[PDB]
Amino acid sequence: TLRAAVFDLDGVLALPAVFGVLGRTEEALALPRGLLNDAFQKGGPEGATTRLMKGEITLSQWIPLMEENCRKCSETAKVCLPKNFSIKEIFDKAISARKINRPMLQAALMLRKKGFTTAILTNTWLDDRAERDGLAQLMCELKMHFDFLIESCQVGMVKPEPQIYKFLLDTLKASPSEVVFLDDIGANLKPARDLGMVTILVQDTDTALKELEKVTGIQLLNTPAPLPTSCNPSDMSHGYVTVKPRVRLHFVELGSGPAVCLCHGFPESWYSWRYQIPALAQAGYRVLAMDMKGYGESSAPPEIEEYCMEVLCKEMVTFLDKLGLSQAVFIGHDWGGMLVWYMALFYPERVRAVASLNTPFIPANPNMSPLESIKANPVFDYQLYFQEPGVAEAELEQNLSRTFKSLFRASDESVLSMHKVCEAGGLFVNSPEEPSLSRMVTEEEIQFYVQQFKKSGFRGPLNWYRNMERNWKWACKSLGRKILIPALMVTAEKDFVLVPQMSQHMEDWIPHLKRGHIEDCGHWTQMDKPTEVNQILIKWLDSDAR
Amino acid sequence: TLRAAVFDLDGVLALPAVFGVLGRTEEALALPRGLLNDAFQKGGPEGATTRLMKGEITLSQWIPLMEENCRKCSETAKVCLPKNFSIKEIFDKAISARKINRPMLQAALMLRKKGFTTAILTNTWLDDRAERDGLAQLMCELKMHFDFLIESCQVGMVKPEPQIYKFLLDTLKASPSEVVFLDDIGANLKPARDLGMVTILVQDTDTALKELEKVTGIQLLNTPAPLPTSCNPSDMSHGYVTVKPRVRLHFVELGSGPAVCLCHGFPESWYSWRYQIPALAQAGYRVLAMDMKGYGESSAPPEIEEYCMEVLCKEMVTFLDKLGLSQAVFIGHDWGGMLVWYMALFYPERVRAVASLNTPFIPANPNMSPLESIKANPVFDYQLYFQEPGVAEAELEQNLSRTFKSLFRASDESVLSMHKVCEAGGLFVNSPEEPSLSRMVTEEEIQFYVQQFKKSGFRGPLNWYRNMERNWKWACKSLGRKILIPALMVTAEKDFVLVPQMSQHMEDWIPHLKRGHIEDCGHWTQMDKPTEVNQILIKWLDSDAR
Ligand SMILES: FC(F)(F)c1cccc(-c2[nH]ncc2-c2ccncc2)c1
Ligand SMILES: FC(F)(F)c1cccc(-c2[nH]ncc2-c2ccncc2)c1
């Protein structure tokens, strides 16, 4: 019974095969068939390529030995290599051309999701080329999805030597009959087969995947579109910055490139961005996913005034000062979306670009009290219920698991009416004791919010709603300004409080505003529609946030 | 009696003054004298510039109002503005041309070092230009050195209005006679003077500094060269990555740009790089200053084998994997210098560039046991003393303050002979109970090492020396390789163990090696000669590490 799947890198998890380029090159240059492929394997186990693959020498040391071999092979063939013929250039192009074979990776992900131990076993080299980073990036992205990465040049062994297969089985802690081994090289398949492992000769991915599906009994082809990569909290880099004596901010950090600061809503976490963090880092950005003040590992002081927009924004500026960042792109959702508009209005020099999910930008009405303004819209009754200190804390903290299960639902699953909350006497008065689990979340993900909320509770988070007059007076100072830095407004069709039509006048104060729109999407935008949020953010970041 | 110094930004802490550009422009374009300067101040307190300075409008909103004003001023003058005349371009160039007035900053640093409360009071704007980052960077660098930054556009008040001076005095919690106020605008000096504050009209810096020196009684001119900026541990961003179940790595993080991973020696800390961290971040790099395994906030497992080079290097690769970094430049000192050469030899694809302070690269001798090799050099006797588990721990842990005070000394201060340590029976047998404090360190800095070493002690750190045979067998696998990635070897003239001549054969295995050499420098390179280390590293990073 199968419990492990092993994949070759070249010609299997990555395409086009770097090997096929020696053939592609012979044809393009009208050189004798197999000439370059023969100089590549010259001397077999004693040869230059085997020393390279075993890690005896680096790729840069190997280049002149391959050129030497290419000339000896051409001499014997009674042919000539052209003037400008470069092995370096041939391999630079080949490696740079090789991309992840997405459906093969998807199959490995599915097998691992179904309990399989997965591994990459590859004959590879120690890359010291000036352009080594592209391959390093590829290996980084690929390896995260597997339990093991076994590279020939690191283990000093090579396929097809039988020791590498015995090394593979020992790392897997599995007997050969429990293992599927996928390879594009028949000679490299034989020792695994000779040992009793299930082997797959990979020519085209589809047939290989049909064979893999047949042998595992797991559907891998014609599968529904998968969710983006998520985050395992214990596998992240956790950051901590003291912004003032009693206040520290926590964040999760992934990737390199322009700083992208993710600002969650109520009652959330850095973990609300779980589906965006790996995708944005993969797109070339340094992601800083915050635990906003009052949440998770960030400080939660009790005072209401510690949560007014002026203070929260000043502290976010200090956060950047302490990390030595002159700028960051600011992406917010719900309450974080509102903070992000105020960061753009008050600190445009610190904001590279600004994006909001659901939260529109609406200027303060100087001729109406913010309390009057909230009362005018029936769907904002929940914010009036949030005013009195202790009332919403008591209900929200009564049963954490019920709180998160009732809140975090897709638009078609909603257990809560946002209408007449005060009159009802609470958010959950017409809600079950044991809500069913939404299709958006697992039990484990609910328990992460439950565990995070056990530290400080709902007081600090609820305090974000308790500064309406303070925020209105501050916001009124910005009434003559416009947002002229790059900006994105993303609307959610089925957010019945932050309705798409609420954002309709935004180009009056943000003329160059860019937009995104998500169909059949509720309030919990990031987990409701992760694939579309990722597509909208990556597209905007690459075009407008450099 | 003076206790506060206040500085204007334009024409005082930053030069050339952005104001002077309107004059420079009139002359270059042969326009009527004071024409542009007049359109700049048009309408006075009611005018466009005052609204800009109070934060009513942004810089981008102000540009067309200034152009409108420039045309009204030119009309009245019976002159014409040329075809291609752009206010945007004039201010883009001016702001971009304005740099920190280094000796004025040096004086403020000196006054603050002498107990003064320092502040920047400036009439500034909300910058939303596409090129706003340059000014954001300038403000970031400048503000860190002061207790307060008061910006007109943030406080809604402007100089010379008297409310801004009353606001300044309230933030300072000081009466006017206790305050020096430096400004280049006489009209802006008057209200501070009228209040009883000591005022300095700043034309040329030297005279202003002579006046400041006269009035404070503190030497600010002709001062000895200052040390680079240091780090305050509680003001840094602290990072934590779990590399395996029982092992977590701690780091300090500052700046943006290519990742630069700093690897300390024995018995050190991330804090050994205190003088390099602000300088390298300021030069355009993202600095990751490690607490190496066994130190500070990083895990310190007891097992000797947890500290062999193969394991330490694998964990540093995992560290990069978890932070989502495909590469980092690796800079090491002492034991960290040795790790950094092995990172280049075993993982060149993960190493952007490699630099070592003091530690040379010497290949393993396959025909001699590493123990025999250590015995061959008299100055390496301390490593033999470090072999037996518990002996060096007991001595090193007996009195922490004495340990760090005895170790951390300049070449001319040394209390320890590195000769016949085993025979003597310890490192400190001929050392005082209460060593004097070295000129390289303060009491406070010694106490930081003392506090860090109280957690795990010396076992994990000493274990780095306890894998000589394991490291030799691993290193022997790399005997056919060369280091062909960018590399820097920095030697310290007076390191009497890691002597400069020990690095003499390095170009045999690193042909493109670049070098640095520090005169009159002991073992503790980073704190012994911080200014020169910074100059050598920044120069090499900008030329070779992109
Ligand atoms: F705690 C509250 F009040 F439920 C809360 C808090 C924050 C946002 C929202 C929200 N905004 N838009 C839609 C929703 C929503 C509707 C139905 N179920 C859950 C959420 C509601
Ligand atoms: F603990 C030890 F053994 F002192 C130790 C540990 C690590 C490095 C060094 C070292 N390397 N080069 C010079 C020195 C040195 C010489 C004189 N005083 C202090 C240090 C010494």
UniProtKB/Swiss-Prot annotation, chains A, B:
Catalytic activity field: an epoxide + H2O = an ethanediol; (9S,10S)-10-hydroxy-9-(phosphooxy)octadecanoate + H2O = (9S,10S)-9,10-dihydroxyoctadecanoate + phosphate; 12-phosphooxy-(9Z)-octadecenoate + H2O = 12-hydroxy-(9Z)-octadecenoate + phosphate; 12-phosphooxy-(9E)-octadecenoate + H2O = 12-hydroxy-(9E)-octadecenoate + phosphate
Induction, as annotated: By compounds that cause peroxisome proliferation such as clofibrate, tiadenol and fenofibrate.
Gene Ontology molecular function: 10-hydroxy-9-(phosphonooxy)octadecanoate phosphatase activity; epoxide hydrolase activity; lipid phosphatase activity; lysophosphatidic acid phosphatase activity; magnesium ion binding; phosphatase activity; protein homodimerization activity; toxic substance binding
Effect listed in the UniProt record for changing residue 521 to S: Loss of S-(15-deoxy-Delta12,14-prostaglandin J2-9-yl)cysteine-induced inhibition of epoxide hydrolase activity
Residue ranges of the region described as Epoxide hydrolase: 234-546
Lipidation (S-(15-deoxy-Delta12,14-prostaglandin J2-9-yl)cysteine): 521
Binding site for substrate: 382
Top enzyme category: hydrolase
Protein name listed in UniProt: Bifunctional epoxide hydrolase 2
Source organism of the structure: Homo sapiens (Human)
